């Protein structure tokens, strides 16, 4: 009903992030195709939450640099949300922000640069930018997909927001579309939910869907990537598009994204609320950072493992749909994996326990 908001620490608590871990010794890389961040907002923010501020550094890719536009409603919102959510939850981690031109090659080069960076050596890459997989040049999808495969082989986890325009992903050709890079099978695709939670329990968690005007989580079935072997037990449905082909199901996991139960953040000096799947990648990047710290070695590519874990590791979202285009309710949430929320929201301490040697 009435819109609410949480600080990142409140959501981490709801998802039971493992205590006593802050990401020390880990570096989280965050990809950005526009805007920038200002030290004032970040300082004010971390101080407001009582956490020691992580070191944040910028990396220039193809001439692009950290350049805030000063508009709290522009890309500075994406850049600062990413750093504030990931940094508030893995404050001991080092954060490296890679700025690149907003072009197909810039996005690709930012990924390859971050993944192979011998200076910052990130173990995790968080991405909150994208586009309909069918709207990208095929050559770019192939190049970026190979870059994520390379990251997997190197032990670097790559997480990406699934989109904020529902099952149609903003296209109006009357067909359903999943977003890229989330569609890549080598990426931990992050969907979005409406979360009602307090420190001790989750009262309700449903698919984020605020209609055409408020946005909804991306999710569906890839028309490009075949169904992965490790995802064959998830009961991914065939595509809802005529032809009903089989394909990689999106997302893999999901977390709070509804702006109506959004994140309180400080953008360009303004205290406000932001949501979108954009917040989920940084949120779980912080979770992985804590897990890597405890394990003493990076988890790297997690998809295959996550899909073989027991039900206790996730909170199953079973209600809602991510259709903001028509009344067909494509696609719908349900028991088990679904094309709106994947395996659901992770229960941190249980995921960590499941990964302990």
Q: Is 316 annotated as a binding residue?
A: yes
Among 240, 316, 319, 355, binds Ca ion (CB under 5 A): 316
Q: String of b and e for 132-153 (b: at least 16 CB within 10 Å)?
A: bbbebeeebbebbbebbbbbbe
Q: Is 141 annotated as a binding residue?
A: no
Q: Is 169 annotated as a binding residue?
A: no
The Cβ of residue 290 has, within 10 Å, a number of other Cβ atoms equal to: 25
- Compute the distance between CA of residue 292 and CA of residue 310 in angstroms, rounded to an integer: 20
261-267 vs 4-6, strand pairing mode: parallel
Residues 74 and 32 sit within 8 Å (Cβ to Cβ): no
Residues 42 and 80 sit within 8 Å (Cβ to Cβ): yes
Residue 39 host element (H or E): helix 39-49
The residue range among 4-12, 49-57, 235-243, 309-317 that interacts with Ca ion, by the rule CB under 5 A, is 309-317
Catalytic, 278? Answer yes
C-alpha dihedral (185, 189, 191, 197), degrees to nearest 10: 130
Q: Which of these, 274, 276, 165, lies nearest to 212 by C-alpha position? A: 165
Q: Is 317 annotated as a binding residue?
A: yes
Catalytic residue among 32, 76, 80, 82, which? 82
The Cβ of residue 296 has, within 10 Å, a number of other Cβ atoms equal to: 8
Minimum Å gap between C-beta 217 and Ca ion is: 12
Minimum Å gap between C-beta 184 and Ca ion is: 22
Minimum Å gap between C-beta 251 and Ca ion is: 11
Q: Tell me which DSSP letter residue 260 carries.
A: T
Minimum Å gap between C-beta 314 and Ca ion is: 9
C-alpha dihedral (316, 184, 128, 154), degrees to nearest 10: 100
Q: Closer to Ca ion at the Cβ: 37 or 314?
A: 314
The residue range among 66-74, 160-168, 231-239, 336-344 that interacts with Ca ion, by the rule CB under 5 A, is 336-344
Q: How far apart are the first and last CA of the chain?
A: 44
Among 338, 345, 347, 352, binds Ca ion (CB under 5 A): 338
Q: Which of these, 156, 131, 102, 161, lies nearest to 279 by C-alpha position? A: 161
**210 sits near Ca ion (criterion: CB under 5 A):** no
Q: Is 38 annotated as a binding residue?
A: no
Q: Closer to Ca ion at the Cβ: 206 or 293?
A: 206
Catalytic, 78? Answer yes
Tell me, by CB under 5 A, how many residues bind Ca ion: 2
Q: Closer to Ca ion at the Cβ: 171 or 316?
A: 316
Q: Closer to Ca ion at the Cβ: 205 or 338?
A: 338
Catalytic residue among 123, 239, 278, 345, which? 278
Query: Which residue number places its CB atom closest to Ca ion?
Result: 338
Catalytic residue among 22, 32, 38, 78, which? 78
Q: Which residues are annotated as a binding site?
A: 316-317, 334, 336, 338
Give catalytic residue positions: 78, 82, 278
Q: Which residues are annotated as a binding site for Ca(2+)?
A: 316-317, 334, 336, 338
Residues forming the site for Ca ion (CB under 5 A): 316, 338
């Amino acid at each position: 009903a009435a819109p609410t908001a949480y600080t990142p620490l409140d959501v981490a608590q709801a998802y039971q992030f493992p205590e006593g871990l802050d990401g020390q010794g880990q570096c989280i890389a965050i990809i950005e195709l526009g805007g920038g961040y200002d030290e004032t907002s970040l300082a004010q923010y971390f101080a407001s939450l009582g956490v020691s501020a992580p070191q944040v550094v910028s990396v220039s890719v193809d001439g692009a640099t950290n350049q805030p536009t000063g508009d709290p409603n522009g890309p500075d919102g994406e850049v600062e949300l990413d750093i504030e959510v990931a940094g508030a939850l893995a404050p001991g981690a080092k954060i490296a922000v890679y700025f690149a031109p907003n072009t197909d090659a810039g996005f690709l080069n930012a990924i390859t640069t971050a993944v192979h960076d011998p200076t910052h050596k990130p173990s995790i890459v968080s991405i909150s930018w994208g586009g309909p997989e069918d709207s990208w040049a095929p050559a770019s999808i192939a190049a970026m997909n190979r870059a994520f495969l390379d990251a997997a082989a190197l032990g670097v986890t790559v997480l990406a927001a699934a989109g904020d325009s529902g099952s149609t992903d903003g296209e109006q050709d009357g067909l359903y579309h999943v977003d890229f890079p989330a569609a890549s099978p080598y990426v931990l695709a992050c969907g979005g939910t409406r979360l009602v939670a307090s420190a001790g329990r989750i009262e309700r968690e449903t698919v984020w869907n605020d209609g055409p005007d408020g946005g909804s989580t991306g999710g569906g079935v890839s028309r490009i990537f075949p169904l992965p072997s490790w995802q064959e037990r998830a009961n991914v449905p065939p595509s809802a598009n005529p032809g009903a082909g089989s394909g990689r199901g999106v997302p893999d996991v999901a977390g709070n994204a509804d702006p109506a139960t959004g994140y309180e953040v400080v953008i360009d000096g303004e205290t406000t609320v932001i949501g979108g799947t954009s917040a989920v990648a940084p949120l779980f990047a912080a979770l992985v950072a804590r897990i890597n710290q405890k394990l003493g070695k990076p988890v790297g590519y997690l998809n295959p493992t996550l899909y073989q874990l027991p039900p206790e590791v996730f909170h199953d979202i079973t209600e809602g749909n991510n259709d903001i285009a028509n009344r067909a309710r494509i696609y719908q949430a349900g028991p088990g994996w679904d094309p709106c929320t994947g395996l659901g929201s992770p229960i941190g301490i249980r995921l960590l326990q499941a990964l302990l040697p």
